[PDB]
Design a binder for these strands. Structure first.
Ligand code: K
Ligand code: K
Ligand code: K
Ligand code: K
Ligand code: K
Ligand code: K
Ligand code: K
Ligand code: K
Ligand code: K
Ligand code: K
Ligand code: K
Ligand code: K
Ligand code: K
Ligand code: K
Ligand code: K
Ligand code: K
Ligand code: K
Ligand code: K
Ligand code: K
Ligand code: K
Ligand code: K
Ligand code: K
Ligand code: K
Ligand code: K
Ligand code: K
Ligand code: K
Ligand code: K
Ligand code: K
Ligand code: K
Ligand code: K
Ligand code: MG
Ligand code: MG
Ligand code: MG
Ligand code: MG
Ligand code: MG
Ligand code: MG
Ligand code: MG
Ligand code: MG
Ligand code: MG
Ligand code: MG
Ligand code: MG
Ligand code: MG
Ligand code: MG
Ligand code: MG
Ligand code: MG
Ligand code: MG
Ligand code: MG
Ligand code: MG
Ligand code: MG
Ligand code: MG
Ligand code: MG
Ligand code: MG
Ligand code: MG
Ligand code: MG
Ligand code: MG
Ligand code: MG
Ligand code: MG
Ligand code: MG
Ligand code: MG
Ligand code: MG
Ligand code: MG
Ligand code: MG
Ligand code: MG
Ligand code: MG
Ligand code: MG
Ligand code: MG
Ligand code: MG
Ligand code: MG
Ligand code: MG
Ligand code: MG
Ligand code: MG
Ligand code: MG
Ligand code: MG
Ligand code: MG
Ligand code: MG
Ligand code: MG
Ligand code: MG
Ligand code: MG
Ligand code: MG
Ligand code: MG
Ligand code: MG
Ligand code: MG
Ligand code: MG
Ligand code: MG
Ligand code: MG
Ligand code: MG
Ligand code: MG
Ligand code: MG
Ligand code: MG
Ligand code: MG
Ligand code: MG
Ligand code: MG
Ligand code: MG
Lengths: 59, 122
RNA sequence: GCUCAACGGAUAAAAGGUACUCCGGGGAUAACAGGCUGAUACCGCCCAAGAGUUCAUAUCGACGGCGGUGUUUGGCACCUCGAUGUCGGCUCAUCACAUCCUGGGGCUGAAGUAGGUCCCAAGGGUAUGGCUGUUCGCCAUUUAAAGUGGUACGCGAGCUGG
RNA sequence: CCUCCUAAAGAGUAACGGAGGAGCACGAAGGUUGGCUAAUCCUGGUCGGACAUCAGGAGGUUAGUGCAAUGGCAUAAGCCA
RNA sequence: AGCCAGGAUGUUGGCUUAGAAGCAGCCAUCAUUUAAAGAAAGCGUAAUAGCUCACUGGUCGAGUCGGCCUGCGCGGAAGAU
RNA sequence: CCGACUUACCAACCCGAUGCAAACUGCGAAUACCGGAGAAUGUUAUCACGGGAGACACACGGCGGGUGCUAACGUCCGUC
RNA sequence: GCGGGGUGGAGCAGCCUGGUAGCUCGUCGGGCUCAUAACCCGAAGGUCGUCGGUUCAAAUCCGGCCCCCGCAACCA
RNA sequence: UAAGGAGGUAUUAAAUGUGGGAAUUC
RNA sequence: CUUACCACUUUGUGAUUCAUGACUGGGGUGAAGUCGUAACAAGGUAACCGUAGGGGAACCUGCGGUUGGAUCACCUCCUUA
RNA sequence: AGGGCUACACACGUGCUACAAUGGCGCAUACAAAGAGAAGCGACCUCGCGAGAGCAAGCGGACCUCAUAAAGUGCGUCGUAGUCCGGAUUGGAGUCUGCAACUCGACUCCAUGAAGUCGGAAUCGCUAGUAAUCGUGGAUCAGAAUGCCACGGUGAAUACGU
RNA sequence: GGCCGCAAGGUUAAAACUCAAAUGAAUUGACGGGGGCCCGCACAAGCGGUGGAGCAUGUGGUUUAAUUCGAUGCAACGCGAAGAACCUUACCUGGUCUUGACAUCCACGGAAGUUUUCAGAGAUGAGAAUGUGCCUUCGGGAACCGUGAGACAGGUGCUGCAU
RNA sequence: CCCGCAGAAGAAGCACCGGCUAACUCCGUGCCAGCAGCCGCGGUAAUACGGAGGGUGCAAGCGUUAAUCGGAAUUACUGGGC
């Protein structure tokens, strides 16, 4: 079971992103839900509730 | 298993040293979010990058529906910023992976039912 | 003046091998088989928490309890050490029933087919091969079925000798 | 070698039975005379506290015996001179 | 004992449940109609239903009930010439 | 610094009630053992000294026990 | 059956002979460096497997229990 | 001043640096 | 009818080629990993070539060879013109 | 409007003040430069231990005010101690500005009296009126400098050499 | 694979796959634990410090409702700030407004004002007195207050890697 | 093959536009989606992706793929080098 999960885990590299934190453009965007924010500092400080609630509501 | 406690594993990826620094940033972010939610966190294991950041970290999160709240963060997080580890200050892209899995209950040991065994002596 | 402590102290002074072996003895004493026993082993039964959608008892049955057999591994050391040859195979068997098939029945969570489980029943029947010295076992392919046992774990003054 | 049980109210009594110790110590830890009495707890009290020393109370040998256990020990066998 | 009647009401007591009506439970478990009729003892229904039954009346007309002590028996109880 | 409440709860000493013990005893027999006296009975049955031994593998049964499985025609004691 | 062990995060001492925990790495803080390592200067961290006993006092002595090691396990 | 010969000089230490860089050009 | 030749067909033993095979050798590749730092400067022991030995690895060492290696300043003393 | 920007296990940079006797304290007494001033500088005098208060000159200033420079010098004391060194912290009582000093102002008085006895590895500035040390003024500014900018006093050591 | 060798190996000699380069000489720089010559508180020669203490101040980190935002090798860290109790302030909590705190335009009213009252923490809302002027073809108009629209205002919001 | 009839009536698409290579802008997009013969393009101001407008080249065809030669003097006999 664990090995199947390890093979299921996408590699940590280009094209496997589900959340993009671009600090130059000052934009953070979740690829799955489309939720986008400009307060990168707050998100890095822990304001993940927007993304998490969006993902849960999407289900 | 949404109600159960969870484990969060953060691993650096393609960025290298920048990826490890980004992994440390993600660790700080998730710890702060857990504090905000009131969950309790502990560091089971950690491997720090030699130059900076962390190569990997395993954190235990305990709370009400902790796995339910954290399970959607599993995946790879892409970071784009002028790498502080590039002499030219170029805009590089680094990747870090967060994986969340529930805390499995310990299995009850089951004694072998003797009616399930055949014994031969010879 | 002795840890002569193996402490009524063999000598001041001493370890091993023998499957190359040998003698005198012992069934006073072990290995096989018999005997006593039955912890263990195998087979039953008692109570009934529970499993079984409901429902303890169709089928199972926890926590505990009571027996039977001799039937494994044992315990003992009664017989045999002026000798009771031993694993498996082969040939030939004979008995028990705790019945594998065929026969008869009860209940079924038995529509039929096909089963499950218990009771009665021992007349007859109850594989050939691959591997291994094998017993056992696994495997291949059959069969109505490929029973479980006792018989010095039947049988070397019948054979074999891996 | 010593102590207890097994050992069946005299002695003794076995097992590869159940439990422990000894192979010393002391010129005082011996003799005698005189004297004295414990553990433990409670209350109060500088440092001082769970536990030092001091005072009182309760208690009555539950202490102690140079070292195991048993039997003894207040007339003390215990403690001091 | 049989045997004949009966064997009601609020009310399916509510909840939790998928449904729960006496009869999965949880959970209260009362009063009313009275001769008596359980918020049910069992069977039974997916649930009801249904079948009983406890209770009680009426005909028949002498025993009937189930514990205690005790004697003797029965099952449990299968082996190899 | 004080401290306040409450308890899924757990509880020393003490008090009341109930058991247990080879290595527990504020109790305690029957027997057995030692000693004294007396009768009857017994071929002195008693003791001492000397001559000659044998035997020191026991078995089962009863009772009291250790061990074992409150197994063994088991094993080890005591006694007949 | 007979021997050993179990101590900062790791590997080893300290036990014997009771009074006291050490070494090396590792960790943490400050330096050096553009930065990391190396290097330098400082710190911290084990109530000693687990219970029990013995002792005025136990890492130490004794006894269980747990884990780990060795050996032995024969004639048969 | 030029040429030739000889002798002395001297650092022990110093590993590493991921992955997104040309408008200035008729 | 018979003999000769001979097609199909049969047997044995080789060759070659294709596919396949537990396992195994190296090769190439990679927007990050781990161990070093071998070369490029005299790359911090010049490098490289043939050969041999050794070593986690780049490599090291010996023997011979090549230049497709950097530097060659400065002080003192002596002699001659 | 109220709160935060002032938080506080901790790490670093830059500063001030010290650890004393080449000094602390008390008394007395010399020598500057530069600058600010009208919702300003504010004399004097009086009151207050003091910060300050009341009254009130002068000055848009080489005129008046801020505004005695301090180190120094003379005398006395302290006599080497955590001190008559240090002045953190804290308690009480006040002043001023300002609507308003709780969070969170400065200053004064009385009490208090911490660390600190010259600082590891390491590291900084300076070549002459410089370093070191001693005072003074300014902007910002209602109030709020150890910071900044500027001004004077005293006033060194050393540079062989690459 | 062949041939040669005792071996080490020699010799002969491919392919698949992969890349868009690999390479030679020279040029300008940059670099060297290459050379030479100079210089600088770079050493050397000194003097006084910092790192230890207390306090001040900035930072980081942490904390917080917020601890506003920036600077962050030398060349950030008593830096923007030549001076945060309120204001500042850009932050937070709460209370409030929506052509609007700050402008222009249009329409419509009202001199400007001044004084009050009440309620509210204040913003503000409601009310009451008091002036009603100045240019002025009694057309007025506009210094100034409101009200109603909508073009607009407004942002110390992001990008110093567009300037 | 010729004559007559009717009405513009029945008849235009494909590729491409960064350079090579004729033809450029807006919007969407944001190292994604995608493009790509080579060089390359896309990571939030794309003449290179996709749509649109405009344009260029061909045309009842236009592109892509496959194949040969050419360019390739890149096997050089013509006609190369060490
Ligand atoms: K002996
Ligand atoms: K021997
Ligand atoms: K032999
Ligand atoms: K039995
Ligand atoms: K038997
Ligand atoms: K024999
Ligand atoms: K049958
Ligand atoms: K049947
Ligand atoms: K039969
Ligand atoms: K076998
Ligand atoms: K048989
Ligand atoms: K036999
Ligand atoms: K025979
Ligand atoms: K006894
Ligand atoms: K005495
Ligand atoms: K005699
Ligand atoms: K006996
Ligand atoms: K080399
Ligand atoms: K070289
Ligand atoms: K190795
Ligand atoms: K300062
Ligand atoms: K204040
Ligand atoms: K003092
Ligand atoms: K210092
Ligand atoms: K001021
Ligand atoms: K050779
Ligand atoms: K400092
Ligand atoms: K600029
Ligand atoms: K866009
Ligand atoms: K030619
Ligand atoms: Mg003896
Ligand atoms: Mg013999
Ligand atoms: Mg015998
Ligand atoms: Mg036997
Ligand atoms: Mg037997
Ligand atoms: Mg015997
Ligand atoms: Mg016999
Ligand atoms: Mg004979
Ligand atoms: Mg039968
Ligand atoms: Mg028969
Ligand atoms: Mg017949
Ligand atoms: Mg077989
Ligand atoms: Mg065979
Ligand atoms: Mg048998
Ligand atoms: Mg047999
Ligand atoms: Mg046999
Ligand atoms: Mg025979
Ligand atoms: Mg043989
Ligand atoms: Mg006795
Ligand atoms: Mg007796
Ligand atoms: Mg005897
Ligand atoms: Mg005896
Ligand atoms: Mg005495
Ligand atoms: Mg006396
Ligand atoms: Mg019977
Ligand atoms: Mg004897
Ligand atoms: Mg004997
Ligand atoms: Mg005997
Ligand atoms: Mg017996
Ligand atoms: Mg016997
Ligand atoms: Mg100790
Ligand atoms: Mg490395
Ligand atoms: Mg690089
Ligand atoms: Mg190198
Ligand atoms: Mg080299
Ligand atoms: Mg070597
Ligand atoms: Mg040559
Ligand atoms: Mg070459
Ligand atoms: Mg405000
Ligand atoms: Mg601040
Ligand atoms: Mg001023
Ligand atoms: Mg001193
Ligand atoms: Mg003082
Ligand atoms: Mg001190
Ligand atoms: Mg100079
Ligand atoms: Mg000064
Ligand atoms: Mg070859
Ligand atoms: Mg110097
Ligand atoms: Mg300091
Ligand atoms: Mg800040
Ligand atoms: Mg900004
Ligand atoms: Mg400064
Ligand atoms: Mg404020
Ligand atoms: Mg608000
Ligand atoms: Mg810039
Ligand atoms: Mg063109
Ligand atoms: Mg295209
Ligand atoms: Mg762009
Ligand atoms: Mg665009
Ligand atoms: Mg396009
Ligand atoms: Mg083609
Ligand atoms: Mg050609
Ligand atoms: Mg050529």
């Amino acid at each position: 079971e664990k090995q199947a999960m390890e093979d299921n885990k996408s590699d940590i590299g280009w094209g496997s992103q589900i959340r993009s934190y671009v600090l130059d453009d000052s934009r953070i965007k979740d690829l799955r839900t489309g939720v986008e924010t400009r307060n990168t500092q707050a998100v890095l400080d822990g304001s993940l509730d927007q993304f998490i609630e969006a993902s849960l509501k999407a289900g | 298993y949404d109600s159960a406690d969870c484990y969060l594993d953060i691993q650096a990826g393609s960025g290298g040293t920048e990826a490890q620094d980004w992994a440390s940033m993600l660790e700080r972010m998730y710890l702060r979010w857990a504090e905000s939610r009131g969950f309790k966190t502990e560091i089971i294991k950690e491997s720090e990058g030699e130059v900076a950041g962390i190569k990997s970290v395993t954190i235990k999160i305990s709370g009400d529906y902790a796995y339910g709240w954290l399970r959607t963060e599993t995946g790879v997080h892409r970071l784009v910023r002028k790498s502080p580890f590039d002499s030219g200050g170029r805009r590089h892209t680094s990747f870090s992976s967060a994986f969340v899995y529930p805390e499995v209950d310990d299995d009850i040991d089951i004694e072998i039912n003797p009616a399930d065994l055949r014994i031969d002596v010879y």
